[PDB]
Amino acid sequence: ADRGTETVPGLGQRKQQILNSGGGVWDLAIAMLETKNLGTDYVYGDGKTYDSANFGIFKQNWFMLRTSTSQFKGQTTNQWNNGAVLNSNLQQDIKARQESQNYYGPDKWFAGHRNGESGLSNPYTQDITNYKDAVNWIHDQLASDPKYLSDDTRFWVDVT
Numbered sequence: 001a002d003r004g005t006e007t008v009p010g011l012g013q014r015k016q017q018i019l020n021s022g023g024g025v026w027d028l029a030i031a032m033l034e035t036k037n038l039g040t041d042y043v044y045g046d047g048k049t050y051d052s053a054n055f056g057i058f059k060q061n062w063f064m065l066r067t068s069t070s071q072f073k074g075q076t077t078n079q080w081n082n083g084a085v086l087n088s089n090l091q092q093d094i095k096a097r098q099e100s101q102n103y104y105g106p107d108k109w110f111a112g113h114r115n116g117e118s119g120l121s122n123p124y125t126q127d128i129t130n131y132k133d134a135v136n137w138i139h140d141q142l143a144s145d146p147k148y149l150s151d152d153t154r155f156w157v158d159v160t
């Protein structure tokens, strides 16, 4: 199916760490879609390099990082490995994503997070809206009962 639910034993411990490190429910929804374990132990850079490499629990790409975060603004494409610090600093990870979205606004943040630099050309394309929709649905689920902020339930969407 398009979407569903699964139990990830222990995940509620990591949910609470995220919410105790400056994250909000909206951040948890984005992280929940990105990885099953709310973790950073996917392949380095998510298998990608330079502006496309992904770091942190949200799999933020280096283009977004270097253009919209206080921690990385001004840095170059070639400096992309600097983003890896987010894989082991959850607070900086959370802070960077929030600053990125507060720099670009939600719509353009979605576009550049999903489609990189070329997504900023038009944030309202269907592939971006599909991603937006998925994060909205997961947030609606987490927001429907406070238990979902501390139990081991994961709401997932297959964003084709």
Ligand SMILES: OC[C@H]1O[C@@H](O[C@H]2[C@H](O)[C@H](O)[C@H](O[C@H]3[C@H](O)[C@H](O)[C@H](O[C@H]4[C@H](O)[C@H](O)[C@H](O)O[C@@H]4CO)O[C@@H]3CO)O[C@@H]2CO)[C@@H](O)[C@@H](O)[C@@H]1O
Binding pocket: 001, 004, 006, 033, 034, 035, 036, 046, 059, 156, 157, 158, 159
């Ligand atoms: O694209 C955005 C974001 O996606 C990330 O991957 C997600 C993926 O989007 C989706 O949420 C995925 O959920 C899995 C889920 O964990 C279960 O394994 C599930 O299974 C099956 C399901 O139970 C049903 O039986 C269905 O009919 O068949 C499924 C397959 O057997 O399937 C879901 C769909 O895959 O979880 C991953 C994260 O692990 C990342 O790719 C990220 O980079 C990305 O930006």
